């Protein structure tokens, strides 16, 4: 199984699924390294973020737990198709790359915060991470190239 993937047991259903401990992705289906990748992301910040401030909100006061709740909500909508990633990144992301549908352009190892870099290189083109934690807050990452 590709870098990071383990079989897990569904607690609700008792059906096996696959969890990726690097990207925090999970899916039912069995899963399937470049110099550069390209990604967008949706950042939800919280009170312990490196900079508890964004274009959306001058003083961010939400807790870590509330941020993770928001992130989970958006992952569910993206996954159900009720909303797409670019749209929720544009409206809700606490990064100013929100202006570019959450796009951050191409990058190699060595430029991004490490949990974000690892998650970004462990994704395949087209794939989305689960919640990725860095000192800026909680990310959903979409690998676009
Ligand atoms: C790893 C990583 C990469 C890009 C960004 C951009 C932000 C921000 O705008 O807060 N945080 C990051 C962390």
How would DSSP label each residue in 100-144?
A: GTTEEEEEETTSS-HHHHHHHHHSPTT-B-S-EEETTEEEEEEE-
From the candidates 93, 97, 120, 136, give the one annotated as an active-site residue. Answer: 136
- Comparing CA positions, the residue from 120, 135, 90 lying closest to residue 20 is 120
- Name the token pair of 73: 């909500």
What architecture (CATH level 2) is domain 36-145?
Roll (3.10)
Residue 13 is classified by DSSP as T
Report how this structure was experimentally obtained: X-ray
Domain with CATH 3.10.50.40 in the chain: 36-145
**Pocket of ligand 1, candidates 42, 43, 105: which has the most ligand atoms within 8 Å of its Cβ, to mutate?**
43
**For this experimental structure, what is the resolution in angstroms?**
2.2
What architecture (CATH level 2) is domain 1-31?
Single Sheet (2.20)
Judge whether 139 counts as a catalytic residue: yes
- The C-alpha atoms of residue 51 and residue 3 are separated, in whole angstroms, by 32
Domain with CATH 2.20.70.10 in the chain: 1-31
- Comparing CA positions, the residue from 133, 51, 139, 52 lying closest to residue 88 is 139
């Amino acid at each position: 199984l590709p870098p990071g993937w383990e079989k897990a047991m569904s607690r609700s259903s008792g059906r096996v699924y696959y969890f990726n401990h690097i990207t925090n992705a999970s899916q039912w289906e069995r899963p399937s390294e470049p110099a550069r990748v390209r990604c967008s992301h949706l950042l939800v910040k919280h009170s312990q973020s490196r900079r508890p401030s964004s274009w959306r909100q001058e003083k961010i006061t939400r807790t870590k737990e509330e941020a993770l709740e928001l992130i989970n909500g958006y992952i569910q909508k993206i996954k159900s198709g009720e909303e797409d990633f670019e749209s929720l990144a544009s409206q809700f992301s606490d990064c100013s790359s929100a202006k570019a549908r959450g796009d951050l352009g191409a990058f190699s190892r060595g430029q991004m915060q490490k949990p974000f870099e690892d998650a970004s290189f462990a994704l395949r083109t087209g794939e989305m991470s689960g919640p990725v934690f860095t000192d800026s807050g909680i990310h959903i990452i979409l690998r676009t190239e």
